[PDB]
Every structure is written in structure tokens, then in C-alpha cells.
Symmetry: C3
Subunit: 283 residues, 3 copies
Amino acid sequence: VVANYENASMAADYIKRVSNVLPDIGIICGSGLGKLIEEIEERKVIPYINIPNFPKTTVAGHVGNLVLGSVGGRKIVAMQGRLHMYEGYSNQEIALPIRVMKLLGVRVLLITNLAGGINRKLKSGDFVLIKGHINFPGLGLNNVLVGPNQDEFGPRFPDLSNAYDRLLQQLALKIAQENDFQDLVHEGVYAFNGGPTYESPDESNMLLKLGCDVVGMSTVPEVIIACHCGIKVLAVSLIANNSILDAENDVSINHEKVLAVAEKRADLLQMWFKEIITRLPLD
Amino acid sequence: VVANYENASMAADYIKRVSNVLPDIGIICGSGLGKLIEEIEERKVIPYINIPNFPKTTVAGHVGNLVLGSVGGRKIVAMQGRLHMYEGYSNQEIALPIRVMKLLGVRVLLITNLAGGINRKLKSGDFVLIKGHINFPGLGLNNVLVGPNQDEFGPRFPDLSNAYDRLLQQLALKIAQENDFQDLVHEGVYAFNGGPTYESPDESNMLLKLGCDVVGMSTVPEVIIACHCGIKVLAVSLIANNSILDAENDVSINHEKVLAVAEKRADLLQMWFKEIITRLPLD
Amino acid sequence: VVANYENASMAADYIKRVSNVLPDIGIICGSGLGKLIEEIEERKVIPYINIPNFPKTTVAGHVGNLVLGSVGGRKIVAMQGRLHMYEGYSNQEIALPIRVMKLLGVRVLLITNLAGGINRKLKSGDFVLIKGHINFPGLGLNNVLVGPNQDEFGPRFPDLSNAYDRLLQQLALKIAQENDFQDLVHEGVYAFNGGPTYESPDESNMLLKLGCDVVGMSTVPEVIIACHCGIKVLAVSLIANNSILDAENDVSINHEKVLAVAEKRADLLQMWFKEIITRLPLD
Ligand SMILES: Nc1ccn([C@@H]2O[C@H](CO)[C@@H](O)[C@H]2O)c(=O)n1
Ligand SMILES: Nc1ccn([C@@H]2O[C@H](CO)[C@@H](O)[C@H]2O)c(=O)n1
Ligand SMILES: Nc1ccn([C@@H]2O[C@H](CO)[C@@H](O)[C@H]2O)c(=O)n1
């Protein structure tokens, strides 16, 4: 199913008729970082499988819902259960939910992920406000926009110079200073590793020489689709580990360790993004 | 449709029977740089859609013709309307037109493109004679030759050490010196960004550290197919902007600016390539 | 055909019923390096085309057998005729033979390949014990594990920190010292170039700046599938040429030169791996 104007309108048509919510903000949350979706007030849970033209996720299994309601006085829509391209989802399957957000009226998309640290300043449990990226799939002919362009959403050749909104980064840092956890907050450049294998020790060393601060398996596809159709983005990485240190010490990585870091910071991040949503200037 | 010996012979069979032209030179021209195709003498325009086994381009739309005739006393064939891989065309769809050029008797292929400047010496409106490339899709398993090899056209493992003919670069520079615009002409290494998003500021910074002078979304696939079947290549980039400077100054890129640079240099480039065609030693 | 638990069990079911061999070691040999497969004692040759669910190789042609028998008192299984991803084989087609090895009881996989030298210390005819890799397809969303995970074989997110067994590298070096050819043996990092074009001169120069010692078109996919399902790996590159030197001197590469180097070292490598198999501690 192509992520075109007609198909995306058919999904939005069904969603408007079931929720009666016109969302202003969209959110996509990382592994173990979805507690905020459970506190959405006056919420309506819509399974992906019930929405026309939404991608099939029964092979991968696990949760897949669209949740609408209120947070901090603002109306929001949330993807519960993330679509990652290492699962095999196509360019069209990634793009359609974001373009449906657009047709519903979303103007700001907030994103969290788990990622590995490259910069020597990054420790486990730190946060990184993303100010740019290095898109290795995009350079290698696997950009999420490869294919015919859907002119109703954006141009054929998008410029990504301002994909990460400066004002949103400044607002997120300001709130961290008000609650005195700014010592955990950095900024940096995110490298998109297709996955699903973690970055190898020598791949980590190469990324250090290329000026990457952080590496992960998600986020960049959603950022490009949002920037294509004029949605502003804030993206925050939670550092699971420092891969450069782990290479020097021959320390392994695994998803259980990653989830444990997510649990250590889940409540702080939920408090953080709730204040961001409340203070957001909508554009 | 596979770009094999039989299918390519069937397209050449139809073209010979309609044009009565045996071309020696092939040309592929960049965006806004196609004026020379309009001055082809005793010309025959053959729409792609009429040629057996030629790829379907109705989804992307816009022009798609094969034009044959004379330039500077030489017989040439031109692709009017370029096939870019960010549109979604497959390896077989890119390869077939070049191999048809081979079966018609083409021995030299001339190429122009628009590209972003990385080297600090490059300014908007400059030209770069390409002497090598960095093929990020090729490294990432998206090489244009991925698939079964068509032995009638070339070997399984091609060497690209001499894909860009030294003598052609020297001839192109010589003509620029005769008309006193050699101050616009550089040489450098071309990085293949799959597209269709422009190179991000941090991607541009990485390319600077890797010794890339220029980055663009085309050309490398055609160069490899030509080198595979023994066709000599000259490739010239027109610099739309300096992406390293634009990152320092937070200046955006867009296709309208790119086309405006193409218009500023279109007539000079047409004059330049017409003299190249006229003086070419055919091999 | 998906490389899942059921399909792989059906291939192993057929193989057990035809060979009556329970192999402990698997081997995959590079171009021109397959002489050891001819000395397998009490051997049973099983064509790929006769094994249920094995990938179709009639388009590429050439040999495709599974060979079982004894070497050095140990029971082994060998792939005769390698599956390379530049031929167009899918992720599932690469993975199934290795997972069938797993279900037959393989605990150690030994691999040889031909590759180009980047490190200035490497000369034609040298050997490189691989201690890590840089997986350019994997970074670019063409990782061999892209797709749904097959939970019966391994986890969704594998760690590759110890994909190349330290003890096996130490054993291979020890045997080279016992026979006084340790002056030919190095260790280094392997870069995976998707192929099938050889690394370009400027691509070679980039790899030097990134800390790659060796570049080739194979091996990394098999290493990842083996590490996924808990099989230990030793991988050795035979250096066909030094691509950095060849760029400085404008010297070409071709498959005939590569095969000639393979013939120069074939008997030494066969003797080397036969002793490795004999001395292997099985785990
Ligand atoms: N180094 C890492 C570590 C974690 N992750 C993210 O967390 C999950 C896998 O641990 C996956 O959801 C993955 O996106 C990552 O991408 N890269
Ligand atoms: N930085 C740039 C700038 C331009 N281009 C080429 O020009 C058109 C898009 O502007 C496209 O046709 C594209 O090939 C490019 O590839 N890279
Ligand atoms: N520079 C090189 C040289 C050789 N090879 C390997 O050898 C065969 C092609 O020569 C192919 O089988 C290929 O794997 C390579 O991968 N890279």
C-alpha cells in the first residue's frame, strides 16, 4: 500500500470518526519509555489493525495502537508500538502513519529512542538532544523517501538543514535546568545504523573518527518524513552505554541491559516530556 | 525486464529501423542542461514508451525520449529525461539503455550533473571534472551491478581504476583554456548520495574528512554500466553550492536555487560540450 | 523461502537421512581455495538442488554441493560453491544453510576468502586473521538479519563484540609458527564491500583513513548468522593485492590475477586448515 494522499486520507477519515480528537502534537516513544501514553487523559485506543491502510504488524507481533487524548491541556496522538526498518517494513509502511498525523493536524512531533554513546563525554543514563544526523542508509540508496514523490505532502528534494528545531532544543534544555538535571543533558549528532546487530567495536571506532556522538537504529526515517511535510521535530536519545569504552574493556551489550537503563530513567523522561508538551509553542 | 543480451538487442533492433543513425557518442545531461539536445541536426526523437523493453516512466512522468542525429559532424544518441535511482528504478532499468547504446555502436559517453561542493575551493557555478568516485550505495550492497552477470557485455568483477578517461579530462581542460574559462574548472572525487534528500550539514562535514570534493545523486550508476561494457566516460559536475560554507552560515538548499545555477551556465556548457564532441578521438 | 525453524529442520532431516554423518565443524572456502573439500575422507556429496528448501543457484550456474565426511579424525560439513550477496541472493537464502549447519550440530565454522589489502604492511600472498569488521551494508539497512527474527535460532539484537573467537586466532597463529610461515600472517579489520566491482582507488583511500586493513565482498553475512545462533568463527583473508599501492602506481586488478594468487597459496592454506581442524577444541 502506497503512502499517497488518497490512502492517508482514508486512514484519517476513520480516525476522526472514532476519536473526535484533533491532535496538535504527535509522539513516538522508545523501548521501555512509553509510560506517558498510559497517562493520556480522556484517551481513545485505536488498534493499527482496525485503521484502513495501516501496515500489517502480525509477523513481528506485540503491541500496535494509535492513542489520542489530552496531555497538559494539549491534544496529542501517540504511536504505541514502534515500526523499525530492521523488521523489514518498507518505505511506504513507515511513511503512512506520519502523513496521517499530518492530515489530522499535527504540527510538532516528539521522539525518544535508546542509543549507544560514541562521544567520550557520554555516560550510561545521559540524554542527548539531537541536532543533526548521519544517514548511512540514505547515502546507500535506502533513504526512506526512495520512490515516486507524493507531491501533496512535500517536494522531491527536501533540505534537512533545519529538520531539528532549534527552539525546541532550547526549550527542552531550559526545563532540565529548572529541575536541576541539566548535568545529564548533552547535544550531538546521531548516526543511523540500519541494524539489527549492535554497532561493532570497529564500527564504533570509525564513527568516532567521523564526528558521530550517538548511534541508533531508528528515528531518522520518521524525522525525514516529518520534515518532508512540514512537521517540526524534537528528538532525544537516552544513552544505554558508551560503545567506545566498552570496546576498550571488552564489555558486551544486550537488550536486557538496554531495557534496565530505560527503567532507570523512565519516570524522569516522562516528567520531562510532559512539561515540554505543556510549554510548547505550537507552529 | 532483465537487461540481458536478447532484450537489449530487441530495443536496438527497433531503434536502427526507425532512425537510420549509427551513433558513435552517447550523452546524458543534467537538470536544466539539456539545451544541446535541441540543436541536434537531422534529429529523430524516439519516445521511451515506443521502444521495446525500455523502462516505464509514467509514474514519475515528465519527458522521456531517445534523440539521434549529428553534432559537430559526429553521430550521437542522447537520453532526454534522466533515470535516477532515487525514483525507484531498478538495477535492470538503469542498465538497459546504456547496453542498448553499446549495441548501437557507442564508444564514448559524456555526462553532466548538478552537485554540491565539499572542497573549500569550489564556488557556485564552477565545473568539476570527475576523476574518481566514492560509491556509498555500492559499498552498501546496492551496487548497480548486483544480480546475475550478463556475460555478453562484461566481466563479473569489473575494475574501476580507469572508469574516467584521462585523455578526455585533458581535452576538456584544453578547450576551457582556449576560451579562457579555465578559472572555473577543477578536478575532484565524486561521492554518490542515494538521495533524494540533500546531503545533511553533518553528512557534508563527514565527506570533507573522507576526501570527497563533490556529492550528488546520479552518474555513478551509468559510469559503472559503461565501464562494464567497455565504453569510455567523461563526467562533469556543475557546482550548485558549497555545502560546507552553507553549514557554517546556516544557508538552505533547494531545487529552485539549483536550477537557477544551471541556467546561469547552460549556454557556456553547451558550447563546451559541442567542441568536445567535435574534437573527440573516438575509441 | 524463509530461513525459519521448520524449513531448516526439513533440510537437516533430508541430510541426516542421506549422509549418516553428524558434523562438528563447518567450512566455507574462498575462490580457488577449495582443494581441502576434495580430500574429505568417507565423503558424501549432496547437490544443493536435491536438498529441500536450499536456494536455487541455476541462474548463476557452477558448482553447488554440500560435502560431509572426516578430516583429521573430525567430522565436518562443507559448502562447495559459495553464495555471495552480489549475485542477488536474499537474506533468507544466505541464512538457511548456516542454520541447517546449526541443526546438524555444528559448533565451529571456518572461513577463507580472497581480499584486497589496505594496510601498508600487507603484501600479495599474505594472510590476515580477521578480528573485527566494518559492515557497510549493515549500516545501510542491508544487514543480513533485516526482517523478522527467528527466535529459535537467536535474539533480535545480537552483539558482535566476540564474533571472531580469540582462542581460534591464537591457535591459527601457533600452527603458523610451528611450520615457520608466521612472517606471512597478520591480523586486522575486514571491510565488507557489497560488490561486485572492486574497491575504487578513492574508496580504498577512504578505507585507509577509517582504520580498515582489508576489504572484500563476502564472509560478513555468514559471520553474523553464525554469531546469531551461537557458532564460533575463524575467518582468514588471503591478500590478492595491495589496493593502496596499486592506486599510487595505477596498477589494475582483475579476477585472473586474484585466482593466480589463490593458486600460489592453495596448498599451504590446505595444510594449515587441516592442522587447525585436527587441533580444534570443540565448543
Ligand atoms: N546501540 C543501540 C542500543 C539500543 N538501540 C535501541 O534499543 C533497542 C535495542 O536495544 C532497539 O529498539 C534499538 O532501536 C539502538 O538502536 N542502538
Ligand atoms: N546537492 C545536490 C544538488 C543537486 N543535485 C542534482 O540536482 C537535482 C536536485 O537539485 C537532482 O537531479 C540532483 O541529481 C544533487 O544530486 N545533489
Ligand atoms: N578486492 C577483492 C578481491 C577479491 N575478492 C574476492 O575474490 C573474487 C573476485 O576476485 C570474489 O569471489 C571476491 O569475493 C574480493 O572480494 N575483493
